[PDB]
């Protein structure tokens, strides 16, 4: 099993969620994060003064899936989350050695 971790623009949440649910991926965890990278914030104005948001709001969506679901989940996330502009985000794949469902004590494939 693998953890799929996608850093996306927050407004893309609904699209990504629909895409995953449609692909039979029915559970996911979402965290708020700030991204720093090539995409810059617009040097804005508040009380008539300059400043820049340096760490931009993103969401991290985490799903644990079977090894043979990674490419499919990746493809779905990419199509739902992309805009073509810098700042679209990244997907990271890492190993998950065990999953346990807290309610039952069920493990692995039976816990997700």
Ligand X SMILES: Nc1ncnc2c1ncn2[C@@H]1O[C@H](COP(=O)(O)OP(=O)(O)O)[C@@H](O)[C@H]1O
| Interface residues toward ligand X, by CB under 6 A | 7, 27-29, 35, 37-39, 56, 58, 62-64, 86-90, 101, 103, 112
Instruction: Work out what residue 74 binds among another protein, ligand X, a copy of itself, none; the CB cut-off runs from 5 to 8 Å by kind.
Output: a copy of itself
Burial class (CB in 10 A: 0-12, 13-18, 19+), 47: exposed
Binding positions for a copy of itself, 62-81, rule CB under 8 A: 64, 70, 74, 77-78, 81
Three-state secondary-structure class, residue 107: strand
- 42, 46, 43, 51: which is closest to 87 by C-alpha? 42
Min dist CB 43 to another protein, Å, is 10
- How many Å apart are CA 35 and CA 88, to the nearest integer? 11
- How is residue 1 written in tokens? 């099993």
Residues near a copy of itself (CB under 8 A) are 2-3, 6-8, 13, 17, 26-38, 54-55, 58, 60, 64, 70, 74, 77-78, 81-86, 88-103, 105, 111-112
């Amino acid at each position: 099993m693998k953890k799929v971790e996608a850093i996306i623009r927050p407004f893309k949440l609904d699209e990504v969620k629909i895409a995953l649910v449609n692909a039979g991926i029915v559970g996911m965890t979402v965290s708020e994060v700030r991204g720093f990278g090539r995409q810059k914030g617009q040097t804005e104005r508040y009380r008539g003064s300059e400043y820049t948001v340096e760490f931009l709001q993103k969401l991290k969506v985490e799903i644990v899936v079977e090894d043979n679901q990674v490419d499919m989940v990746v493809d779905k996330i990419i199509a739902a989350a992309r805009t073509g502009e810098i700042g679209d985000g990244k997907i990271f794949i890492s190993p998950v050695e065990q999953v346990i469902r807290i309610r039952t004590g069920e493990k692995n494939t039976e816990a997700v």
